[PDB]
Structures are given as C-alpha cells and as structure tokens.
C-alpha cells in the first residue's frame, strides 16, 4: 500500500538514481543482491520500505523503479555494475541514438519510438501495486532526453493514470558542468510542457551543489559523482517519511498540502544541513539548533536565490536522527527571533515539522561525514522565481537571434512552441510576483 514508482530519465536522472538507490539499500540494510536479512516476511509485506521496494519469493527486494535513456552507455554501467542484481532487466530500458541535447528529438523524433515500451514497463510495476500513490520522475532540464522525453512521458502518464500524483526531481543547469549551449531552450520547453502535469517539483541547481561541494567539502573540482552523492542525501531526506515510519514522522503528502497554495506554485526550495567533511566533523557535535540555523543560510540551498529578498508561503522542516521536539521548538523560537523570516499575509507563519529517528547514512568513499542528526528544509518562497528569471534571460538572448532554433525546426517543431513556452514562463514569473503582494 502507498507504493511509489521512481522513473529515472536520461544520464542525470539515471546516475542520480544510482546514488539514491544505493543509499536506500544501505539505509534499509539491503544487499547488492537484493537480500535483506532483517526482513522476516518473505515474498512480500506491508512495511514502510515496501513503498519503494517490492519482494520476490526468493527474498529479493526489488526497487520499484524504471531507468530510461535513449542511448545505452549510461544504463549499461548499471547493468554490469555493483547493483546489477538489484534490478530486473526489463526495468532498464535503452535506445541506440540519443536526443543530442535536443528537446525535439527527445519528445518527438527519437522519443516516440520508445515511449510505448516504457509505458508498458511502468504498467508492469503499477500492476504489482495494491495502492499506488504516485510517481517520482528524475531528469535533467538541459539534456534532450531529460527535457524532451520526460515531457512526453509526463503528458502520457497524466492520460494513463489520470491525476495520480507525479513529483519531479529536476536538475537545473549550471555552466560549470553543462554540456550544451541550448540547455536554456530545453529548460523552458520542458518546464512549460510539464507544468500542468506535475504536482510538485524539487529543482536542483547544479551550481548550488557545485559550490556546496567546493566550499563545505573542500572538493577542488566536483564530479557528477560528488554532486550525486550530495543530491541523494537530499532526496533521501525528502522520501524518508515514505520509506520509514515513526510516531513523529510526517508523510510527504502532508507537507505538500502546505507547500502548494496554487497548482502552478509547486516548486519548493530545498536546504540541507549539515554538509561537512569527516575532518571538520571530528570532535564536533552539531546540535539541532546549529543545523536548523544552517537552513536559513542561502549558501546551503539547492537553488541559488535569496529568500531574504522574497516572501515565504510555507516552511517545512524534515529532521532525521537524534532529534526531539523540545530542541526543535527551541531552535525555531530562536530563529524566529534572530532571523527575519517574512511570510505573505495570507498564510500562517508556523513551521511544519517532521522527525524520523533513523539517522543519516553515508556511502563508503564519500566525502560527507556521518552525522548523528540532519535536517532538510522545504520552503515555498517567491525567491525561487529567480531561477526562472536567469534561465529566461539566457533564453531571450539566443531566441532574439533565433540561434540554434533550426536544430529544433528541422526535427518538426515550430517557432510558435518557443514563444508559447516563453510566455507561460513569463506568466509564471508574474504569478510569483502576484502571490507576494499584500492583500487589500
């Protein structure tokens, strides 16, 4: 019951999927061959981790996940890698020719050739569910598959599963690790097309993750491996309420009620702490008060923006590990006093709090210190619109000259789709302004 199917699209989606599922396994005590000694109910069960893992009669715990990429090399490494036994081959779907960093090829030319197969494999997972809650879609904004195929899939999922919940983990592009000049195009196109088909979307600014790795972990030049291991911790904190259960645990759907005041305003800002090296964490007890304070330092945000220069519509705190309500309430009280957290006038100011007693886990060889307690803040702030504004500016500079537009037209798209998508974005930036205005 309350099963959740994960869909990982494109390189970024897949490789982040590798990090996440590796982390999930270590958190639940699941071996690379899928075995879980602590699980005494063989062949099935209705425990909390069963929302993310199905069970075979042989005792194998299988991720409720699909991996999709229009080229095989990234998923092939999953097929031959450390956790190859973890997945059934039909969960790992591949093409031959990728989208070449083109949204058009991902949504149309190449994507149409594999979409039916993907939906069939997703259906096979859905049929295993006694009470499917919804989907988690992992993808990049910039890639052709991450942008184009994801939009195609999201459209199709709304048709085949109605208003079943669909959550996104979207990788927002950064020049330090970008691989295409047209990522602003692919970004605006996929955001426009997916907007009405997504209920909630957590944006991950690669530059924000890049900086956190450089400043807080002293990684000279972060790799995708460095970025992904940090992202997985944030994804883990958000899904922990689904995979574990405790007295103080608060389901992600309850937070979602507070985080989305209007359908289009569904992009929460994530902030995670503590991100600290083993060297620095040694003989350093990070209190509930200290990590909660860190959530309001913009340097720790998943998206580069300034909430101090915006208004709050919601503030959620997702704690895990050695944390009790008393300390949390004290820490918040201190913050509400010291920090100026300004809400819009039409929402209450109380912070919604959740606590999972299971402490954070780290993967071997990682740079993150294993801490006794961590927190992820999910806030709805008008400041997130900054990320739209930056992308929209880059989009405009190129589109004014129609730079690279022929690559899209040549694959069947029209200029009208570009202007249509950009206008939706302009309306979205405007919506975020409007919600921040005081009432009459």
């Amino acid at each position: 019951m309350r099963e959740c199917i994960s869909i990982h699209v494109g390189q970024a989606g897949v490789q982040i999927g590798n990090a996440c599922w590796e982390l999930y396994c270590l958190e639940h005590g699941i071996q690379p061959d899928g075995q879980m000694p602590s699980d005494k109910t063989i062949g099935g069960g209705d425990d909390s981790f069963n929302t993310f893992f199905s069970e075979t009669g042989a005792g194998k715990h299988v991720p409720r996940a699909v991996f999709v990429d229009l080229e095989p090399t990234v998923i092939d490494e999953v097929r031959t890698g450390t956790y190859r036994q973890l997945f059934h081959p039909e969960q790992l779907i591949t093409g031959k020719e990728d989208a070449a960093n083109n949204y058009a090829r991902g949504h149309y030319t190449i994507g149409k050739e594999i979409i039916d197969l993907v939906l069939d494999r997703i259906r096979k997972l859905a049929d295993q569910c006694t009470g499917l809650q919804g989907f988690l879609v992992f993808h990049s904004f910039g890639g052709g598959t991450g942008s184009g195929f994801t939009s195609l899939l999201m459209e199709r999922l709304s048709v085949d599963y109605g208003k079943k919940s669909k959550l996104e983990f979207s990788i927002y592009p950064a020049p330090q690790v970008s691989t295409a000049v047209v990522e602003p195009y692919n970004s605006i196109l996929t955001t426009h097309t997916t907007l009405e088909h997504s209920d909630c979307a957590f944006m991950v600014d690669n530059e924000a993750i890049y900086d956190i790795c450089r400043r807080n972990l002293d990684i000279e030049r972060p790799t995708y491996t460095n970025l992904n291991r940090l992202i997985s911790q944030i994804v883990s904190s958000i899904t922990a309420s689904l995979r574990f259960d405790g007295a103080l645990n608060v389901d992600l759907t309850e937070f979602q009620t507070n985080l989305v005041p209007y359908p289009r305003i569904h992009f929460p800002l994530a902030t995670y702490a503590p991100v600290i090296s083993a060297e620095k964490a040694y003989h350093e007890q990070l209190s509930v008060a200290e990590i909660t304070n860190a959530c309001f330092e913009p340097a720790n945000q998943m998206v580069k923006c300034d909430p101090r220069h915006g208004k709050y519509m919601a503030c959620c705190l997702l704690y895990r590990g050695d944390v009790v309500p008393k300390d949390v309430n004290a820490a918040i009280a201190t913050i509400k006093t010291k920090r100026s957290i300004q809400f819009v006038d039409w929402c209450p100011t109380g912070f919604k709090v959740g606590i999972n007693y299971q402490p954070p886990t780290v993967v071997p060889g990682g740079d993150l210190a294993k801490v006794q307690r961590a927190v992820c803040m999910l806030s709805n702030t008008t400041a997130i619109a900054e990320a739209w504004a930056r992308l929209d500016h880059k989009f405009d500079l190129m589109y004014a000259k129609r730079a690279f537009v022929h690559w899209y037209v040549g694959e069947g798209m029209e200029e009208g789709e570009f202007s249509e998508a950009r206008e939706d974005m302009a309306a979205l930036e405007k919506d975020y302004e409007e919600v921040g205005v005081d009432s009459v």
Binding site: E71, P72, T73, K96, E97, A100, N101, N102, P175, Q176, S178, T179, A180, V181, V182, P184, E220, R221, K394, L397, M398, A400, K401, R402, A403, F404, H406, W407
Partner: protein
C-alpha cells in the same frame, strides 16, 4: 556503437587521410596489420567509432579511399599502414581530373561516383547506428574538390538524417602554383555551405606560415604541413574517439557549434606548435592567432561558439580557472547573445610525444577573412573570364560561376551580420 564512415578523396584527401589513420591507430594501440597491442582499455572503449572488427580480433578502418588517379592508391597501399585498409574499399579511375572541378563533379567523377557509393552502402549497412560521415579532401584540386562535393550530395540523398562532416584543405599561392585553385575552391564552397553540417577549414596558407615563421622551416614540404593537419585532426576527434561528456558525437558537436545552418565553417587551432607547458600557457597559445589552422585573426571578428579540448594529465581546476580567465579578459571577442558558448573537455590520454596539448575549434566571424581572400583571387580571373574554356568545355555555364561567387559573398555578409549584432 555510433559508427563514423571515413572517406578520403583525391591526392590531398588521401595523404592527410592516411596520416590521420596512422596517428589515431597509434593512439588506440593498433598496428599496421590491424591487431591490438595496447596498454589501456580506454583505447578500445569507443574503438568501433572508426574501426570495424574482423575475425581474429583485427581492427579495420571504416575508411573509403577514392581518386580519379590510380597513383594515389598504390602510394597509400605501399604506405606504413597501407595493409590495414580494406582492399575492396579502394575505388579509383585512370584518367585523372587534372585540377578541373567540372571533370570531378560532372564528367569523370560522375562516372565513378556510383562505384564509390556501393562501398559506402556496404559499410553503412553493417553499422549498428551510423552517426555520419567525415570527408578529407582539398578544394583547390579537381577530384577532392569536385568529386568530393559530388559524393557529399549523393550520400546526403541516401542518408539525409545523418551528419556530414568535412576536413577541407584550402588552396594558397604560397604552396601551389596552379592558378585555377580559386575557381575550384569557390565552386566547392558553394556546395559545402548547402550540404555539410560542419566543415573544418584547413588553410594551407596558415600551414605554410606556421612551418616557415614559427617552426622555422625554410622550405616546407607537404609532409611538414600534414604533420600539423594530423595533429589537428587527432585533436578535434578526441571527444569522438574516447569516453567523454562534451561533444561525444557528431550531432552533439554540431548542436553546440552551429547556431545557424550555413555558418558551419570552423577555425581549428592547436598547441603547442613545436619543432626542433603550463595550463595557462596552453590556454594562451590555443587562442593565439599564430596557432590557428586558418589564416584569420580572431581579434578581427567575434566567436559565435568555441570547443576547447585539453589532453594530458593536468589540473582540471586550473583549466576551468584559465578558460574563465580568457573569456572575461577577452569578452569583447565572444558574442554576448549566446551565453556560455565556450565548452571545455579534458581527456587524460595525451597525443604521441607530448605530455599535454590543447586543441581549439572556433566558429568565428573572422573566418570571412579566409573566404574574402579566395573571393579576391577568384574575381581577378573571372572578371576577364580567364581559363574558363576548360570548364565550359565540360558543359558548365557562366551563370554557375556567378552563383557560386554570389553565395560565397553572402556567407561573408552573414558572418559580418552576426559579428555586428548586439543583445540590446
């Protein structure tokens, strides 16, 4: 998995084509017999991009050798790696083209084109996922310039959804005394601008000036020029041949490098250029005019897009800092209406003999200086209709020379347009 089909046409095309295969074969650890004796698995990771695998673990270049003159075939065949190539992939006539573009495009070459295509089809049919083709040729001759552009058009007819890439060698009075080279070049450019997705401009003028001024070679040979070409060709194809992220295939390169379909003529660059370094030094030189393989000054135009490729063991932190340094210090020479137009890749495998190198691929509006030079030499003869009878004798019309001249002038104007363009 993503196979490229190599084609080399004419004397020049085959010469640089041969050298290209010698160099990358060494990099990938292939011997002249086609056997693998290498030390790193990175060599064989993407070997199928350029090499077919045969019985007994033999690696055969997916290469097609073409010429209207049978002499070229023997020279290659009796070359160092001549025995590596597929015998049936040798396609040749007898009569030669004799520096006549019309002969290679309409007459002599048109007779031979079908037998070439048959070889192309057989190679392509066996491709798991053909990404496209790359041609090596000159624009000054008649076979490489004339039949090469014909082959492009015919191949594009049967594979219209595949990438067409070319390594075009531009003529210069400093290396060749044939006077109709501006005719052949202009007629070729007229074809390239319409039917290729990305063209590397190899300028003999630039190759000569480098060998004479920089390398200090009093009398540069064709072997001295090709040494540069092979080093360049090895560099710009590094991202294709080894496991990587940036521009790992021909289409992704084209998307990053070609903002407008006609403006696909690249200015390659290499560093270090030496004959008998730090990351800042490598970066300085690769953006230096003295290191460009096209006789153009990038400070006389603006970069639309740039692909930089660093090879060797170095600090990626240092590379990232320096590449940012160049763009900030030379921001005026990068168009502002294409954000983040400079992409950088780093391969751990250095080329033969070097500890670390840097390959540069630029789409600069300063490339017009190259086309302007040809246009000036072209018009000087066409205004008086000189040597025209050799072309019209093959059935051509004067209006076709007019159109080629006009289209080339248009290309220049279009580069000037986006050079003069601003954001605001």
């Amino acid at each position: 998995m993503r196979e490229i089909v190599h084609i080399q046409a004419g004397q020049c095309g085959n010469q640089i084509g041969a050298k290209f295969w010698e160099v990358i074969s060494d990099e990938h650890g292939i011997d002249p017999t086609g056997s693998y004796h290498g030390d790193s698995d990175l060599q064989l990771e993407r070997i199928n991009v350029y090499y077919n695998e045969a019985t007994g673990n033999k690696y055969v270049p997916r290469a097609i050798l073409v010429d209207l003159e049978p002499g070229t075939m023997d020279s290659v065949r009796s070359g160092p790696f001549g025995q590596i190539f597929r015998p049936d992939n040798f396609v040749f006539g007898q009569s030669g083209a004799g520096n006549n573009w019309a002969k290679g495009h309409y007459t002599e070459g048109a007779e031979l084109v079908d037998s070439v295509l048959d070889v192309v089809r057989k190679e392509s049919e066996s491709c798991d996922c053909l990404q496209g083709f790359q041609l090596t040729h000159s624009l000054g001759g008649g076979t490489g310039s004339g039949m090469g552009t014909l082959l492009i058009s015919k191949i594009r007819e049967e594979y219209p959804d595949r990438i067409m890439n070319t390594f075009s060698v531009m003529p210069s009075p400093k290396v060749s005394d044939t006077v109709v080279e501006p005719y052949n070049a202009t007629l070729s450019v007229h074809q390239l601008v319409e039917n290729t997705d990305e063209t590397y401009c190899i300028d003999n003028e630039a190759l000569y000036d480098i060998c004479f001024r920089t390398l200090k070679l009093t009398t540069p040979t064709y072997g001295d020029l090709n040494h540069l070409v092979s080093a360049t060709m090895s560099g710009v194809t590094t991202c294709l041949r080894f496991p990587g992220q940036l521009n790992a295939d021909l289409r992704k390169l084209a998307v990053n490098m070609v903002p407008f379909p006609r403006l696909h003529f690249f200015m390659p660059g290499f560093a270090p250029l030496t004959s008998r370094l730090t990351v800042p030094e490598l970066t300085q030189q690769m953006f230096d005019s003295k290191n460009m393989m096209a006789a153009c000054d990038p400070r006389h135009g603006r970069y639309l897009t740039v692909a930089a490729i660093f090879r060797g063991r170095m600090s990626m932190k240092e590379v990232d800092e320096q590449m940012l340094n160049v763009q900030n210090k030379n921001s005026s020479y990068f168009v502002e209406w294409i954000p983040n137009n400079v992409k950088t890749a780093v391969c751990d495998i250095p080329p033969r003999g070097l500890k670390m190198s840097a390959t540069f691929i630029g789409n600069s509006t300063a490339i017009q200086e190259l086309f302007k030079r040809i246009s000036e030499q072209f018009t000087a003869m066409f205004r008086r209709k000189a040597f025209l009878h050799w072309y019209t004798g093959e059935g051509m019309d004067e209006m076709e020379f007019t159109e080629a001249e006009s289209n080339m002038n248009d290309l220049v104007s279009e580069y000037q347009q986006y050079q003069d363009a601003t954001a605001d």
